From a paper:
Dominantly inherited mutation D395G in the gene encoding valosin-containing protein causes vacuolar tauopathy, a type of behavioural-variant frontotemporal dementia, with marked vacuolation and abundant filamentous tau inclusions made of all six brain isoforms. We used cryo-EM to determine the structures of tau filaments extracted from the frontal and temporal cortices of the individual with vacuolar tauopathy. The ordered cores of the filaments span residues K274-R379 of three-repeat tau and S305-R379 of four-repeat tau. The CTE tau fold differs from the Alzheimer fold by having a more open conformation of the β-helix region, which contains an internal density of unknown identity.
Three types of filaments were observed that were made of two identical protofilaments arranged in different ways. Filament structures were determined to resolutions ranging from 2.3 to 3.4 Å, which allowed us to establish their identity as CTE filament Types I-III. All three filament types were found in the frontal cortex, with Type III being absent from the temporal cortex. The three types of filaments are molecular polymorphs consisting of two identical protofilaments that are linked in different ways. By cryo-EM, the tau fold was identical to that in CTE, SSPE and ALS/PDC. This is the first inherited tauopathy with the CTE fold.
Numbering used by the authors:
A (entry chain C), B (entry chain A), C (entry chain E), D (entry chain G), E (entry chain I), F (entry chain H), ...: 305 to 379
The structure:
């Protein structure tokens, strides 16, 4: 009675070509940071951060991506 | 009675070509930061951040992307 | 009785070509930041940020994108 | 009784070509920022930000995009 | 009565080519950080961080990715 | 008695081919100069120069030279 | 009696081919100079230079030279 | 009596081929100079230079030279 | 009586091929200089140089030389 | 009586092939110099140099030389 046929075909290509990648320079919090405090009161949770935190330099030669979902559902 | 046939065909291409990529320079919080406080009162949660935080330099040679959903659903 | 046939064909191309990409310069919060406070009162949650935060330099050689949905649904 | 046939064909191309891309310069919050406060009262949630935040330099060599939906629905 | 056939075919390729990748420089918290405190009171959990923390330099030669889900579900 | 004959032939070519030439940035400049002088004596001619002088940026697309001397001399 | 014959032939070629040339950055510059002088004496001509002088950035696409001398001399 | 014959032939080629040339950064510069002088005496000509002088950045795409002398001499 | 014949032949080639040339960084520079002088005496010509002088960055894509002398001499 | 014949033949080739050339970093530089002098005497010409002088970065893609002398001499 029923025939289902699921024949997707994919010959795709995600591509990149880069002769030369360079001279990157990241210089966060190069300056001066000063914190003075007097007579502070805290009745609840404190988080502090002070300085140069969480600084990223992310230099992929590629960095190319592909996402592909397939789904076939039946009642 | 029923025939379903699902034959998508994809020969696509997401492509890039870059001779030379360079001389990038990121210089956040180069200046001076000063914080003075007197007689502060807190009855609830504090989060602080002070300085140069979360600074990103993201330099993919590629950075090319493709997303493809397929779905086939039946009652 | 029923025949469904789903044969999309795609030979597309998203493409770019860039001889030379450079001399980028990002210089946030280069100046001076001063915060003085006296006799502050807080009865509820505080978030602060002070300085140079969350600054991005995003330089993809490619940066090309393609999105493609396919859906075939039946009652 | 019924025949449905879904044969879209796509030979499209989204394309760009750029000899040289450069000399970009982003200089936010170069000046001076001063905040003085006396006798402030807060009965509810505070968010502050002070300085140079969230500044983006986004320089894709490509930056070309294509979106394509296909849908075929039946009762 | 029922025949289901699930024959997706994939000949895809996510690719990159990079002649030379270099001269990367990450210099967070190069400046000076000073914290003075007098007469602080805490009635709840404290987290502090002070200095240069969590700074990443991530330089993959490749960095190319592919994700592919397949699902076939029946009642 | 004497026969002198000078028949040089030249079919040369100096050639160049450059797709794209970009992104030069020269800064012979920015800095400070101070000169203080007390009780100086000069008994012969003086030349001075003070500041940013004679600084060049020379970006020829071609920039190809060809120099050819011919000489024929008789006594 | 005498026969002199000078028949040079040249079919040479000096050639160059460069897809893309980019991203130069010269900074002969930035810094500070100070000169103080007291009770100096000069009995003959003086030349001075003080600052940023005679600094070049030379970026020819071609930049190919060819030099050819010919000489024929008789006594 | 005398027969002299000079028939040089040259079909040479000086050639270069460079896909992509990038990302130069010269900094002959930044630093500090100080000169103090007291009770100096000069009885003959003086030349001085002080600062950033005669500094070159030379980036030819080709940069190919060919030099050829010919000489024919008779007494 | 005398017959002299000079028939050099040259079909040479000086060649180079370089896919991608990148990422140079020269810093002849940064540092401090101080010169103090008291009670010096000069009875003949003086030359001085003080700072960053005559510093080169030479990045030819080709950079191929070929030098050829010819000489024919008779007495 | 005399017959002299000079028929050199050259079909040579000086060749180079380099896929990718990268990532040079020269720092002839950074450091401190101090010179103090008291009661010096010079009765003949003086030359001085003080700082960062005559420093080279030479990165030819090719950089191939070929030198050829020819000489034919008669008395």
């Amino acid at each position: 009675s029923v025939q289902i046929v699921y024949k997707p075909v994919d010959l795709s290509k995600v591509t990149s070509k880069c002769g030369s990648l360079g001279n990157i320079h990241h210089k966060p919090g190069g300056g001066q940071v000063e914190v003075k405090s007097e007579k502070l009161d805290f009745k609840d949770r404190v988080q502090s951060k002070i300085g140069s935190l969480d600084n990223i330099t992310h230099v992929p030669g590629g960095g190319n991506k592909k996402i592909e979902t397939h789904k076939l559902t039946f009642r």
